[PDB]
């Protein structure tokens, strides 16, 4: 219908609202530096990965590559090798001024194809290296099961809390470690670009600008889209005496009106939680699980 014309107009406002631009902005598109396109290229590819399986306003994405090593200088290399783990370090001192606005950070490394891998499947673990003193020396972040012989792919980890300390205490930025999983009583056959040799390992820091920071659970009863209490007692409201327990559950329901512009509005359910019932047929007991029975929150869509 012509309500597509409204989706278009609702999208126009949704873009400027998340960016908090009262009006649209301009350079020339004939020559945009490739380094700028790489930041767009990595954020896109990241979300493409999550697709394959305070939140409203847009978030600025910053890309911090691996420090370039020049062997003629007096600099400690960014990478260190070991048959069972790799060590990588980033220099994130430029973002220390913006640490108060960081929301999420992800360390993205590309896993190359190792056609001559001994073990075809391995579990790798990501650690935040720590400065110890005497008798921990590392903190677990996340693990992943990778295919050492498969086609190359990008691997991402949520390293928000680790990068957070690095922006506060520069003397703790000791880097990451990609260790092979050990059952605690085999070599790391997984190769990564930039570590085992445009696929540079890099961090993707995502901030929420301050000007974008301003500066329906059980419903502040109201008559707009809002959760409403409903408790259904099986004997009372249904005449059912075959459910022995629960005697009744809060079913709830969504009701109200949402503003107009998002397309057209409806007050519907957002998240639902299952329900357990115990009933009987003959002398046989049935303890069963029914999904999507309890309305916990409402939304407009």
């Amino acid at each position: 219908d012509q309500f597509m014309r409204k989706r278009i107009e609702a999208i126009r406002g949704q873009i400027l609202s998340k960016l908090k631009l009262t009006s649209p902005p301009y350079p020339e598109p004939e020559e945009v530096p490739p380094e700028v396109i790489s930041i767009y290229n990595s954020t896109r590819d990241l979300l493409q990965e999550k697709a394959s399986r305070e939140e409203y306003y847009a978030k600025e994405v910053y890309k911090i590559d691996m420090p370039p090593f020049f062997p003629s200088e007096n600099a400690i290399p960014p990478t260190f090798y070991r048959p069972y783990f790799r060590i990588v370090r980033f220099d994130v001192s430029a973002m220390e001024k913006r640490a108060s606005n960081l929301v999420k950070a992800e360390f993205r490394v590309f896993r190359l194809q190792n056609p001559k891998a001994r073990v075809p499947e391995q579990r790798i673990e990501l650690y935040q290296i720590l400065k110890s003193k005497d008798l921990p020396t590392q903190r677990y972040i996340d693990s992943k099961v990778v295919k050492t012989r498969a086609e190359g792919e990008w691997l991402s980890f949520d390293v928000t809390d680790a990068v957070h300390e690095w922006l506060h205490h520069k003397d703790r930025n000791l880097g990451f470690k990609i260790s092979l999983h050990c059952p605690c009583c085999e070599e790391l056959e997984a190769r990564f670009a930039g570590i085992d040799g445009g696929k540079t390992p890099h961090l993707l820091l995502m901030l929420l600008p301050s000007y974008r920071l301003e500066s329906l659970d059980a419903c502040n009863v109201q008559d707009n889209c809002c959760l409403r209490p409903l408790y259904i007692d099986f004997k009372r409201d249904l005449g059912w005496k075959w459910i022995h327990e629960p005697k009744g559950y809060n079913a709830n329901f969504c009701a109200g009106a949402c503003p107009y512009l998002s397309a057209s509005p409806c007050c519907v359910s957002q998240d639902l939680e299952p329900l357990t019932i115990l009933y009987y047929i003959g002398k046989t007991p049935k303890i069963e699980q029914l999904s999507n029975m309890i309305v916990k929150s409402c939304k407009c869509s």
Partner: nanobody
Framework: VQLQESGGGLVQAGGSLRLSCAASGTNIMGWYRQAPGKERELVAGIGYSSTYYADSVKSRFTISRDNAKNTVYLQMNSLKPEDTAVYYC????????????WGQGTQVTVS
């Protein structure tokens, strides 16, 4: 701090040689190299028994350290005529990603 290197001389083409670097004072460590005319280059590096080797020395040179004796080694095997230079071992600055500490180092020339 103090850094003293030893080992090094003339070796037969294709031979081996073990350089040493002792730390007699008060820890990422590595080995540098400067050929006549050419600029410096980090050949090997040890740290957190973690290692960093250069591409021209990979699978030929080996770095090591005796945490008891505080000596860093450099096993130069399968030498080539291009590995001729003075080798300077270096230590890490107490808290920075610097080097700071160097030594005079010995010279090696392979025929």
């Amino acid at each position: 701090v103090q850094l003293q290197e030893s080992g090094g001389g003339l070796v037969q083409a294709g031979g081996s040689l073990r350089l040493s670097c002792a730390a007699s004072g008060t820890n990422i460590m590595g080995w540098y190299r400067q050929a006549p005319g050419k600029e410096r280059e980090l050949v090997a590096g040890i740290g957190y028994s973690s290692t960093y080797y250069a591409d021209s020395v990979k699978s030929r040179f080996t770095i090591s350290r005796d945490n008891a004796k505080n000596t860093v080694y450099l096993q130069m095997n399968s030498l080539k005529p291009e590995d001729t230079a003075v080798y300077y071992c270096a230590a890490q600055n107490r808290d920075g990603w610097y080097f700071y500490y160097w030594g005079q180092g010995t010279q090696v020339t392979v025929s």
